Amino acid sequence: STIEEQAKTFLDKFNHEAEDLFYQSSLASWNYNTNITEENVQNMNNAGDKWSAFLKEQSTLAQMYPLQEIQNLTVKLQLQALQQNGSSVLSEDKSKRLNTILNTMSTIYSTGKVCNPDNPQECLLLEPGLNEIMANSLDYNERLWAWESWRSEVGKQLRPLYEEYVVLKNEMARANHYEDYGDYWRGDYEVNGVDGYDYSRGQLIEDVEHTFEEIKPLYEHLHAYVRAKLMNAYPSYISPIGCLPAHLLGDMWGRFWTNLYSLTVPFGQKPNIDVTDAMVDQAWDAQRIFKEAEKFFVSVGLPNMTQGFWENSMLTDPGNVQKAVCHPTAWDLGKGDFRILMCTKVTMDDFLTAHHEMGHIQYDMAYAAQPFLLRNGANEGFHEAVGEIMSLSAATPKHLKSIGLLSPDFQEDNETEINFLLKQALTIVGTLPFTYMLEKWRWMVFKGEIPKDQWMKKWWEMKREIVGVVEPVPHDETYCDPASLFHVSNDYSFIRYYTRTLYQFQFQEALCQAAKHEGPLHKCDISNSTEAGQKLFNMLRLGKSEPWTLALENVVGAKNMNVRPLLNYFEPLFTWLKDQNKNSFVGWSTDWSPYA
Amino acid sequence: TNLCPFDEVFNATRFASVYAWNRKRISNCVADYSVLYNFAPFFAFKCYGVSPTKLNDLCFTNVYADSFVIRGNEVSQIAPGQTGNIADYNYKLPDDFTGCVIAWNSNKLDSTVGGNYNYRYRLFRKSKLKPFERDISTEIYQAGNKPCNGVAGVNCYFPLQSYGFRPTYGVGHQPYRVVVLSFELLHAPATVCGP
Ligand SMILES: *[C@@H]1O[C@H](CO[C@@H]2O[C@@H](C)[C@@H](O)[C@@H](O)[C@@H]2O)[C@@H](O[C@@H]2O[C@H](CO)[C@@H](O)[C@H](O)[C@H]2NC(C)=O)[C@H](O)[C@H]1NC(C)=O
Ligand SMILES: *[C@@H]1O[C@H](CO)[C@@H](O[C@@H]2O[C@H](CO)[C@@H](O)[C@H](O)[C@H]2NC(C)=O)[C@H](O)[C@H]1NC(C)=O
Ligand SMILES: *[C@@H]1O[C@H](CO)[C@@H](O)[C@H](O)[C@H]1NC(C)=O
Ligand SMILES: *[C@@H]1O[C@H](CO)[C@@H](O)[C@H](O)[C@H]1NC(C)=O
Ligand SMILES: *[C@@H]1O[C@H](CO)[C@@H](O)[C@H](O)[C@H]1NC(C)=O
Ligand SMILES: *[C@@H]1O[C@H](CO)[C@@H](O)[C@H](O)[C@H]1NC(C)=O
Ligand SMILES: *[C@@H]1O[C@H](CO)[C@@H](O)[C@H](O)[C@H]1NC(C)=O
Ligand SMILES: [Zn+2]
């Protein structure tokens, strides 16, 4: 009886217990997300406590099987998932201090209160309030007031907590046989053991710079176009050869440029495609929306949705009698239970969100036969990519013409093409530099290359040199600007968005090539293509059973992340921008600042 | 006429667990298979060996019926020459098995909100199981090189596990009652057959 038959039996017992415990927890959470009452909150608390206690106990018993004596590459992954120590490597005092710091920072972010200096009897929160201010205002001084206040009253209280957070997380990482917390985060993409499909944790960095170097020219042209069109709204606040101010990007932190479409629209006269009225006038309801999505998924070879999906899923807001959390979520309770929670309305946005969440459900259904610890995406950037691609396929004018939402005599021009392409680029291409900047800054801080007294200096130098944005007012070492974002105050990773954004267009190009599509890649509908569906399903069923290198190769025929498919998607927009920028300057200078 | 009562096991109140499966013998009666066609929705109705149409005009010696209930994705293992946890450690069918197996959904009766843990099967066993053999043993299974003396944990596990059926499960995790019919022909004169 070697270690193999000892690990196998332990994994069998864990597999048969975790399913029941997680099902109970998921059912309690679903009941709370439908009904809001103290009893349901208590039920969630009890179920979660049982699940966490069982998980720790099994993780403690999982350390008696050394990894070097096990050779299957299937049971090794389950034990690797189970054997992660985490906070147990620290003392009780340090662990409780870390939890206290995390809860304090989360509470400060959640209840962040800023008030104007004229009347404390009426003042705003983050949501709503400041978000509406910096999403729907054209005033320069009010946006600056909100931007500086949120980082003044809130940013002050997080830096002393953030420093101790960094120190304690680094202690935990070094106790877990790592180098730092950034190495711990990069450990998600680590692959060892399989010959020819290896991936070191330091390779992720080099791949990120290599992809960004090819991303840069398109971002520079988009930056030039946005800067040229923002000088008409703020005539005396932007330099033609400089960097965009950080408080005029349509968002609190500049993560997305979505709210600048009204100011940067290429052809204002021609509107975008909106089938909300064509849905209102033809007796379209939520049930028909989800039936249409199911028909689309069946047309490519993927199976139906279960009989329990249509009965146990709440697809409409209950009303004032009940209280439910309206947030589109795809639920995998396990044991053959799949549900979608959505307060669906008759709208094109909900029409695409239905496809997103049903692609999530299909991806979950694909790997239902895998063991419990291997039922998830290949990495952290694969599960949303499928939802995004199967949402992109449903927004094409050809698909909407096929289902009768658009008139048959509708002829599409090359102006709506550019409008849609720029709308996509404002939210897809405009977020990659921000993610790169934030993750690179956090990695340097965790390593120790940035001393404690140069955090803001390095932060703003990186912002000017990579993103191309400049602070409106100077910040000293008393502020913690990165902590103002949700994903920094709450301990969360951030590179998954970059990886998903690059993966989704690779998947789309592969499937469109498999569908014999002729023309631009942005006009792609994968409907009525059984060959395309099988190619995607060959990857969807793997789970974590195989390295994400092989999973990616199954679909795109390549072992590494690539950016050329992304560039091919925006080629017409790139040519249009190059033609429109022939009389402007492309690039920015770090020296210029608004307060200079 | 004393008809063979093929309606008392098909319509019982509570069935037995997979590992502890009961046996009901049928003899000294005339068999009418028309009443077997009741309960029209059948999940799986396959016969190995004899044919259902010609089963009426055939006289045998004894007929054995065994009753158990399993989950949806395990009915495939009530076929001969099949390997699985149920097919190896709970119930075995010979390579030359003759008869039919009948399975149908039983979600409404055998499922309870909050879980139904009263039906249990076996997951660990030192050796495999010979055909038509039962095992109600409950000794502690040893997965290591150290004696256990009878205790849970450390490297010891309880062999039998509880299904925990719930009405909201999927089609493969929902209960499915299963009955197996076996036929034997001994040197004794055949009596068990209908008109
Ligand atoms: C997907 O295909 C269906 C069915 O069309 C049939 O199969 C195709 C592969 C092709 O061989 C067609 O010639 C076949 O008729 C399409 O549904 C039909 O669409 C046409 C549009 O001209 C319509 O007149 C029919 O009434 C539809 N039949 C139905 C709804 O039963 C569907 O439009 C295709 N989806 C696309 C192209 O996105
Ligand atoms: C997780 O932590 C446990 C203990 O907190 C580690 O178990 C010890 O590992 C050391 C390593 O040399 C052994 O010398 C000890 O005998 C182990 N047991 C105890 C009780 O200390 C475990 O190794 C940690 N996990 C990892 C992956 O390092
Ligand atoms: C859940 O909400 C429904 C809607 O009125 C109500 O009838 C039911 O009692 C609620 N459940 C609990 C446990 O309160
Ligand atoms: C790994 O373990 C599984 C568990 O059954 C087994 O099927 C598989 O054959 C093992 N891998 C190899 C290479 O034998
Ligand atoms: C999916 O459901 C539709 C309608 O219920 C049916 O026509 C179709 O055959 C189903 N597909 C499969 C693979 O069963
Ligand atoms: C669209 O096509 C017309 C056709 O002549 C062409 O003149 C024009 O340059 C194209 N592009 C735009 C943005 O209109
Ligand atoms: C099974 O028993 C119930 C309860 O008496 C009865 O109503 C039903 O008709 C029986 N089924 C058959 C096939 O006789
Ligand atoms: Zn999603």
Author numbering:
A (entry chain A): 19 to 614
B (entry chain B): 333 to 527
What does the paper say about this structure?
Receptor binding and immune escape have been recognized as two major drivers for the evolution of receptor-binding domain (RBD) of the viral spike (S) protein, which is responsible for receptor recognition. Receptor binding is a key step for SARS-CoV-2 infection. In this study, we evaluated the binding properties of BF.7, BQ.1, BQ.1.1, XBB and XBB.1.5 RBDs to human ACE2 (hACE2) and determined the cryo-EM structures of hACE2 in complex with BF.7, BQ.1, BQ.1.1, XBB and XBB.1.5 RBDs, respectively. As previously reported, the binding interface of SARS-CoV-2 RBD in complex with ACE2 was divided into two patches.
In addition, BQ.1 is another descendant of BA.5 sub-variant, which has gained K444T, N460K mutations compared to BA.5, and has evolved into BQ.1.1 and BQ.1.1.18 by gaining R346T substitution. BQ.1 (KD = 19.07 ± 4.08 nM), BQ.1.1 (KD = 14.70 ± 0.37 nM) and BF.7 (KD = 13.37 ± 0.29 nM) S proteins to hACE2 are comparable to that of BA.4/5 (KD = 14.37 ± 0.41 nM). The residues participating in H-bonds and salt bridges contacts in the RBD of the five complex structures are all conserved as expected. In all the five cryo-EM complex structures, hACE2 H34 possesses two structural conformations. The H-bonds and salt bridges interaction network in patch 2 of all these five cryo-EM complex structures are extremely similar. The side chain of F486, V486 and P486 point to the α1 and α2 helixes of hACE2. Though the side chain of V486 is shorter than that of F486, V486 is also a hydrophobic amino acid that can interact with the hydrophobic amino acids, L79 and M82, in the hACE2 through van der Waals force (VDW).
